[PDB]
Amino acid sequence: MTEKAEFDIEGMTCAACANRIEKRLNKIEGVANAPVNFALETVTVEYNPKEASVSDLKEAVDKLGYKLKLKGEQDSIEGR
Ligand SMILES: [Cu+]
What we know:
2 helices; CopA; folding; five-stranded antiparallel β-sheet; binds copper (I) ion; hydrolase; Alpha-Beta Plaits
């Protein structure tokens, strides 16, 4: 089952910022994966909406400093 969720990240000026998110994300219970993509400025989070939630991990990202918001939820990304 699981779900894919796609989010736009603002402030992660270094790859270490991004990696720190991945670290936090991994620390959330019932996450599958969540590699942060340093080009499109987006992360594709994969998890189950049972033990974790988009809103929860949002706060977990905000906890690190940089901002996060919705982007999509079907391996799509979108942009110009
Ligand atoms: Cu950084």
